């Protein structure tokens, strides 16, 4: 219920997802 | 126990049940005789 746990989970879900999407889009465009 | 008339032959029976197992081993020995042709 703590804010720290929820925000850590959200960041861990989102940031690597964004990084992987960046790399995949770069690869697919090339 | 066995009937008294057959009492002396008690030891032989003690060996009988394990005989079939030996058969399978014999097969391997036979294969060793023919050098596993």
């Amino acid at each position: 219920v703590n804010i720290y746990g929820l925000t850590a989970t959200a960041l861990f879900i989102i940031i690597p997802t964004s990084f992987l999407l960046i790399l995949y889009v770069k690869t697919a465009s090339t | 126990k066995l009937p008294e008339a057959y009492a002396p032959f008690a030891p032989i029976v003690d060996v009988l049940p394990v005989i079939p197992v030996f058969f399978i081993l014999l097969a391997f020995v036979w294969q060793a005789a023919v050098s596993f042709r």
Binding site: - | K1, L2, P3, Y6, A10, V13, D14, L16, P17, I19, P20, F23, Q31, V34, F36, R37
Partner: protein
Amino acid sequence: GRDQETTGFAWWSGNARLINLSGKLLGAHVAHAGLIVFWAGAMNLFEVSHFVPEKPMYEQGLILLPHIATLGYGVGPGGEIIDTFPYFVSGVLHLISSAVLGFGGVYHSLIGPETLEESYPFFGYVWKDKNKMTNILGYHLIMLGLGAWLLVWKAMYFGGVYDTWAPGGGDVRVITNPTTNAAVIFGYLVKSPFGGDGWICSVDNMEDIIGGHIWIGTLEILGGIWHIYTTPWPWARRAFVWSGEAYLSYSLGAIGVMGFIACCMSWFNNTAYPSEFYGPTGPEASQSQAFTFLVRDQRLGANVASAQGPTGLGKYLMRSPTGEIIFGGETMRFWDFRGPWLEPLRGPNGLDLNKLKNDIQPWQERRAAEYMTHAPLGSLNSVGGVATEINAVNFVSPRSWLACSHFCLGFFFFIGHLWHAGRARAAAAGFEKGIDRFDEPVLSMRPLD
């Protein structure tokens, strides 16, 4: 023998070289049958030589004598043993018959003709004949039916069978009126296998067993006569593989199912497997413990009905989910157990309190104590009791050994069905050796699945 170059089968698969050698295959089968009979006779003699008639059979780890005793040979009322000569006779008869069968097998394997398709056309057969195979199947079906009718005659005319549901302790009885009604006989087969029903493991009287054996013997004789004078219909040829390995796989699957059924029947049933010889079952031990504790506490002076347990359900007696009065505690799972020593205390709606008060005979109490002592629990070291026990007992119930061994055998034979059925189908198709490498089926298929 042969070698790998001529046959294509390595030594560790050598018996596969006999698929198209009828004489050698027949010799092998006869020798194996001789081995089976030899083990039967030798083990019977071994158990006879180590049998102490004063003690119960299940307390000495005997698994073959209980069968003969259930057939009703040398057994008095209550399972007491009168004499042990018939066991010796059966052992020696199997031993000598096995000697003869072994001689026949070694002859047919070493000297007899390799293939008997031309010298003895009656016994010859091609795996794809589809008509000689049915002839052999009919012959063996007739033989099986004759065996079943032999059991029926033994139970009906020549002596009797050990009925464990007879008044008092069970004893040998003649089944004068077997249950031949079609509905009763065939209700067992279509009954559910789950708890309470139990499928064919729920037979609770010798009359039903004998009637069922009458039915199966007659059906097998009729089916054998049918199969001798008939060939499979086109729909049968359409949905079957006709090769030796295919028949082997069918037999493997059927016999694995049979092994599983035997495991369950040995574990649960106590009519065709009297507890006076095989020992108490799983549920029987727990029910006996509860009954003995109830009797002892009532004798010491207590109200068994008004004995609330720690959880409030009831220490001694409670109600089943259907409504019957049953023993309380963790034994609620075994509330549908039935036994000859407990039924006289059962009324229309379960256990009767009035009967539990002043209708318990001493033999019931003694049997309950004896069964509760010798629970089917055990250890691989033959210890007995729960795993957290001292080394003071040397008891493992025969029921546990039978169940475990036959379940393992059934599982392995189901695996054998899988293997041999797959290989037979592949070999009949023609790609059991590998992909063609030049006409590969996948390369001609549309890509992207």
